[PDB]
Amino acid sequence: HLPLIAITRNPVFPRFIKIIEVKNKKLVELLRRKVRLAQPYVGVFLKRDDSNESDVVESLDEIYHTGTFAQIHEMQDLGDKLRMIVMGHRRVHISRQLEMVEVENVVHEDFQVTEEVKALTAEIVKTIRDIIALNPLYRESVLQMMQAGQRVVDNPIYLSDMGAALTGAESHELQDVLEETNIPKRLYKALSLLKKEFELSKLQQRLGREVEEKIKQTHRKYLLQE
Amino acid sequence: HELQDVLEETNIPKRLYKALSLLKKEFELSKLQQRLGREVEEKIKQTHRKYLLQEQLKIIKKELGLEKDDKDAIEEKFRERLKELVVPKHVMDVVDEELSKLGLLDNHSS
Amino acid sequence: VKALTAEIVKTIRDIIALNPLYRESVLQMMQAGQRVVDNPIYLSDMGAALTGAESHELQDVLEETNIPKRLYKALSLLKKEFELSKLQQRLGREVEEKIKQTHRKYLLQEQLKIIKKELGLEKDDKDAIEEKFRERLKELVVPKHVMDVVDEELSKLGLLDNHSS
Amino acid sequence: HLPLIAITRNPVFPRFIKIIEVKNKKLVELLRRKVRLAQPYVGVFLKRDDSNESDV
Amino acid sequence: HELQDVLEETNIPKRLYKALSLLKKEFELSKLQQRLGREVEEKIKQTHRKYLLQE
């Protein structure tokens, strides 16, 4: 029974550390009111299209039904007065956020036979390796800690979510991947997100090499003219 | 576990045949996945080429090296300057071609 | 009393690293951890030789009689050179980054044009005008003497860009 | 006659160079004690279903 | 022509000597072009670097 938080353009992918710094100070009152608790926590929800902070505080239907509840780790507040840490621990698809009642309706069907189902996983981490190699966003040390050979991925859905966090897909798209209920549908959608980034990247790369070689063809003949 | 089972076999034809059978099943799994993924990839390819050309359009727009604001202001300014005049055709077409030249050129060339 | 020497040799290594004047092999021959500095006055003088300080300054360093005073003055000289070196280095990177921001932004703008040059590769102007001249030309009982020029000039029009004078 | 190594989800196929990086520091004492040994060696084995380091 | 001339030679040390001479003669021409190219490039560096100084 806490008011929804004003996410204000802050996606919290499952099992991916994130920070929330809302500019309003009315949310700090709620963050300071939970410091008396022995186990403080915060919930994370996603916003709908045409974001609006005034509608988030006026009505509670703007926020999507999906939520990722988690516990806070620790406040720092070095520069601003609202530096909260968020995490994706318990995913949820609230039946009605307006009513607040909640239930962990985390559907997760998976085949018993997990032999053919991990061959695509090899391609997912390979696509992540090519996405971080051709489009490096974050460090590769997390990939060396959590290896493929060394099967220490106790939560594959979470590893896929952490890998999908590298995707540049719109927040809406993330909600759409969460909307998918079957596990192979969301898995292919995550792969689709990767491909959508991949197409643009390849376009940019071809365009860049083309312009650069044109510059080389320019200047090299100028060296010849010299 | 499967590796240990393949190692338990002592005779060479037995382990070789078991290894090949294991290769057959693994290749069958990888093939069905590669085909299902090709089908899904085709279902993603179903998105129209207009969207791709729209992507190139937004790529053009989302840049900080596009048409000069100063030139656009002069462009509209001279257009409104002509808006009300009983303009002869000669000056009209010459003004239009020169305005294109204005759009093309850099903001500091003489 | 030997604590100042450690900062003097670290500053001299930073002076030859950021402003390399002479080789560092003399610095490895006479190091501070192998009991190879039998003459500190001489080592300070040799270290002070790397300085670019004015002759006047050298005389000023000689005026000092006490050892920590001349060492401190030598340090002041070191700071004067260090100040000049860091100024030049920052200044150089600044000018170069201005050049990079120049050319790089031109690379982006160049990309913008190239992709907005042949966005639709249909010669909406070049071809329409050449074909236009052709049908307008088609019906006349033309001299062949002119056809040579018109066709080669058609090729030149196919080469040149539209905006060009 | 050496204690079993804590493979910890690391398959070492025969005649295939492999690297082992256990997080525990208890295996380094045995690795430092075999450098002084005349013949330095280590054995590699495979684990059964449902891996468990406490059972190893 | 030179290849045929090397074939005309019958002794083995004569063709070997000519082959070495052929190799050096081409190398000499190559090196002349290479020296000229690096020289032109160094001239360009001395050009532009002074422009960096003037700027």
Swiss-Prot record, chain B:
Which residue windows are coiled coil? none
Protein's cellular compartments: Mitochondrion matrix
The free-text tissue note of the record is:
Duodenum, heart, lung and liver, but not thymus.
Q: Which family does it belong to?
A: Belongs to the peptidase S16 family.
Q: Which disease does the record tie it to?
A: CODAS syndrome: A rare syndrome characterized by the combination of cerebral, ocular, dental, auricular, and skeletal features. These include developmental delay, craniofacial anomalies, cataracts, ptosis, median nasal groove, delayed tooth eruption, hearing loss, short stature, delayed epiphyseal ossification, metaphyseal hip dysplasia, and vertebral coronal clefts.
Q: What is known of its domains?
A: The Lon N-terminal domains are crucial for the overall structure of the protein, maintaining it in a conformation allowing its proper functioning. The AP-domain (ATP-binding and proteolytic domains) has a closed-ring conformation in the presence of AMP-PNP and its N-terminal entry gate appears closed. Upon ADP binding, it switches to a lock-washer conformation and its N-terminal gate opens.
Q: What does this protein do?
A: ATP-dependent serine protease that mediates the selective degradation of misfolded, unassembled or oxidatively damaged polypeptides as well as certain short-lived regulatory proteins in the mitochondrial matrix. Endogenous substrates include mitochondrial steroidogenic acute regulatory (StAR) protein, DELE1, helicase Twinkle (TWNK) and the large ribosomal subunit protein MRPL32/bL32m. MRPL32/bL32m is protected from degradation by LONP1 when it is bound to a nucleic acid (RNA), but TWNK is not. May also have a chaperone function in the assembly of inner membrane protein complexes.
Quaternary structure (record): Homohexamer. Organized in a ring with a central cavity. The ATP-binding and proteolytic domains (AP-domain) form a hexameric chamber, while the N-terminal domain is arranged as a trimer of dimers. DNA and RNA binding is stimulated by substrate and inhibited by ATP binding. Interacts with TWNK and mitochondrial DNA polymerase subunit POLG.
* Protein name in UniProt: Lon protease homolog, mitochondrial
Name of the gene encoding the protein in the UniProt record: LONP1
The shown range, given as first to last of full length, is 344 to 453 of 959
